[PDB]
């Protein structure tokens, strides 16, 4: 309600105890902003690990999708937020979630150069050669954006499935 807006702002701004106060006061954990983001997307995006943990404990849908099909795991993988990617995967995140352009968390971590994140996604069963709407794999995105070290990690996981 009124509380949904306040919850989105607190999640986004990293006010962890204000998040705890609004949740106990009945705020909708799955409130969505104008672009479809829940408080869990905004906390994951902005690297607020404590708030991620609080929202997951208070019932947040770990696989909520925004207006272009991003999950919280997409945004944490793109921003390189390792501990958030781990907690999301331990609490039921879909490691292979594709947005509306067929982009996965592995595609985003490969492009934006997050090698530790790429390894953690593979560990948790990321499809190493997921193709987007342009036929591109995470390997092609790592090559295209000059992250050859991530390309090597991905070509070794593909040879050994």
């Amino acid at each position: 309600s009124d509380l949904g807006k306040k919850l989105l702002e607190a999640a986004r701004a990293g006010q962890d105890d204000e998040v705890r106060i609004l949740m106990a006061n009945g705020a909708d954990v799955n409130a969505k902003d104008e672009y479809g983001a829940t408080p869990l997307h905004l906390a994951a995006w902005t690297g607020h690990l404590e708030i991620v943990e609080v929202l997951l404990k208070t019932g947040a849908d770990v696989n909520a999708v925004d207006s272009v099909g991003y999950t919280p795991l997409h945004l944490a993988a793109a921003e390189g937020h390792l501990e958030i990617v781990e907690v999301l995967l331990k609490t039921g995140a879909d490691v292979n979630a594709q947005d509306a352009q067929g982009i996965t968390p592995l595609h985003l971590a490969a492009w934006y150069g997050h090698l530790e994140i790429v390894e953690v996604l593979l560990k948790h069963g990321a499809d190493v050669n997921a193709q987007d709407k342009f036929g591109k794999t995470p390997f092609d995105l790592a090559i295209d954006n000059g992250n050859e070290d991530i390309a090597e990690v991905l070509q070794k996981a593909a040879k050994l499935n």
């Binding site: 995006w45 272009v68 492009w111 987007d132």
Partner: peptide, 15 residues
């Protein structure tokens, strides 16, 4: 390409 993405901001959007 964008240096960052975010909610509502698709990965493939021109530059």
């Amino acid at each position: 390409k964008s240096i960052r993405i975010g909610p509502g901001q698709a990965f493939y959007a021109x530059p």
